[PDB]
């Protein structure tokens, strides 16, 4: 066994290098030439708030076992992740680093690192995916606290102590650093915003949300306080090992990638723990735009399968809002969920409604009797109030997926509404502009219905359809229904 600085980086990385004239992005979907130029312990900027930099971090903390799974990772990036852990962590707080080689083409990527102090390598003899690989690493762990990292990360100064402190005080906290960005093209290390929380839309795809102006204001007193998050990104977190086991690890029937971050976030919150982001902890990650590896069965179907398994166990009736956003998911078989259901029963977990109301209230939820909801799209344009109020015209604007003036519902009363304003047919002569007015159930001018496979909107009791052809010369209008592209409209959720 060899101390990390004695490891022969040049030999290890040499001989998987990008050959002359080859594409430096093909194998990893990041620039391997730039990754390979970097020293295994390259210096990176300290991106922490000033207040963190002054704190002196407590000493008697439990050690952690670090689990890193990988499938065909670039040698330079894998080695660098391991050395940043060793170099930036107090040595007594690292019990071990467990590398789970998830059936990489070349077993030597992992096995050669087994020489390094504190490194243990486990090789899957077939492809298992990240969920089963993480569970195998956790099972092998000897410490009281687990730490998970992706195989292309770089820990910053005093990254670990702030995370361990939270969980030593209360083992039901599952905590995450702020994830800095390692640029996929040039490998520069870039400090991320600390004003973000994890979230998702009804398609159940992870996204970053800014804190509200009010949340921000209430932290002005302690700007590096923990941030409660509805959802963790998934790959970088710290969790009490007995807690991880008691809550049921991960769903072992999830495959490859996707959905497990959603499942564990829902499970932790609903079953009595919490999820935090800790601003004094900073770890960089190579964010990329494409997966470099295969998905047996196709990536769209695997992602959907995994997500169904989460939605069917945790979301109660709200799962229907996911199926309304992604109707093609209803056709994807998802297997047996009985042991997950029994887990939920055994833990006495709160219902999903409680999660929505108490953990993620800012997620906009449709009324239970809405016919359709979300944005109303025509190509890459969306129905938009333009900031107008009652008596104002309505228009289209490029879809931006940020809600506000592009948020609509088709109600049980057949009205197309935003807040308490409704699209109103003020004049039935073809070519007339429509107007926003206060919604009244008894106003027949405000009644609309979806036609032609939920692809158009017709004013009830007429042959008039909602039409955008006059959008830049006045606003949306009503025109006789016909084969015009300017009459095509689709809600993002159809119930």
């Amino acid at each position: 066994k060899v101390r990390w600085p004695d490891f022969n980086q040049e030999a290890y990385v040499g001989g998987t290098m990008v050959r002359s004239g080859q594409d430096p992005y093909a194998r990893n979907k990041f620039n391997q030439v730039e990754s390979d130029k970097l020293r295994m312990d390259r210096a990176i900027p300290d991106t922490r708030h000033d207040q963190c930099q002054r704190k002196q971090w407590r000493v008697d903390l439990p050690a952690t076992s670090v689990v890193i799974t990988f499938h065909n990772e670039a040698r330079s990036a894998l080695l660098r992740t391991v050395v940043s852990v060793l170099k930036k962590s107090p040595p007594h707080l690292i019990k071990e680093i467990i590398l789970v080689d998830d059936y990489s083409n070349d077993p030597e990527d992992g096995a050669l690192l087994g020489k390094i102090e504190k490194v243990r390598v486990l090789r899957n003899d077939r492809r298992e995916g990240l969920m089963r690989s993480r569970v195998r690493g956790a099972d092998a762990a000897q410490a009281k606290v687990l730490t998970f990292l992706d195989s292309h990360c770089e820990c910053n100064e005093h990254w670990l102590e702030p995370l361990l402190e939270r969980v030593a005080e209360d083992r039901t906290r599952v905590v995450s650093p702020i994830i800095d960005v390692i640029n996929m093209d040039n490998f520069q290390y870039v400090g991320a915003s600390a004003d973000l929380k994890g979230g998702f839309d009804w398609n159940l795809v992870f996204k970053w949300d800014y804190m509200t102006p009010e949340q921000r204001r209430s932290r002005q007193g302690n700007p590096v306080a923990p941030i409660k998050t509805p959802m963790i990104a998934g790959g970088l977190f710290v969790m009490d090992k007995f807690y991880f086991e008691e809550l049921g690890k991960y769903d072992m029937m999830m495959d490859v990638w996707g959905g497990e971050n959603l499942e564990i976030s829902f499970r932790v919150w609903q079953c009595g723990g919490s999820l935090e982001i800790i601003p004094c902890s900073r770890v960089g990650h190579v964010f990329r735009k494409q997966h470099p590896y295969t998905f047996p069965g196709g990536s769209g179907t695997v992602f959907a399968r995994n997500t169904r398994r989460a939605a069917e166990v945790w979301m109660d009736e709200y799962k229907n809002f996911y199926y309304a956003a992604v109707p093609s998911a209803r056709n994807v078989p998802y297997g047996n969920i009985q042991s997950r259901l029994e887990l939920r029963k055994k833990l006495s977990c709160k219902p999903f409604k409680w999660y929505l109301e108490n953990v993620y209230p800012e997620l906009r939820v449709p009324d239970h009797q809405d016919i359709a909801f979300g944005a109303l799209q025509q190509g890459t344009n969306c129905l938009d109030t333009l900031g107008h109020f009652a008596d104002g015209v309505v228009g289209v604007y490029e879809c931006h997926n940020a809600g506000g003036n592009q948020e609509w519902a088709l109600t049980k009363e057949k009205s197309v509404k935003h807040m308490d304003l409704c699209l109103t047919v003020v004049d039935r002569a073809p070519g007339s502009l429509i107007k926003l007015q206060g919604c009244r159930e008894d106003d027949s001018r405000q009644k609309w219905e979806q036609i032609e496979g939920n692809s158009k909107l017709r004013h009830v009791g007429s042959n008039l359809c909602l039409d955008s052809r006059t959008a830049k010369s006045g606003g949306l209008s009503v025109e006789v229904c016909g084969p015009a592209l300017s009459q095509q409209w689709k809600f993002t959720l159809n119930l």
């Binding site: 702020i178 994830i179 970053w208």
Partner: peptide
């Protein structure tokens, strides 16, 4: 397919 902070 994960998006950056």
């Amino acid at each position: 397919s994960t998006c950056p902070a």
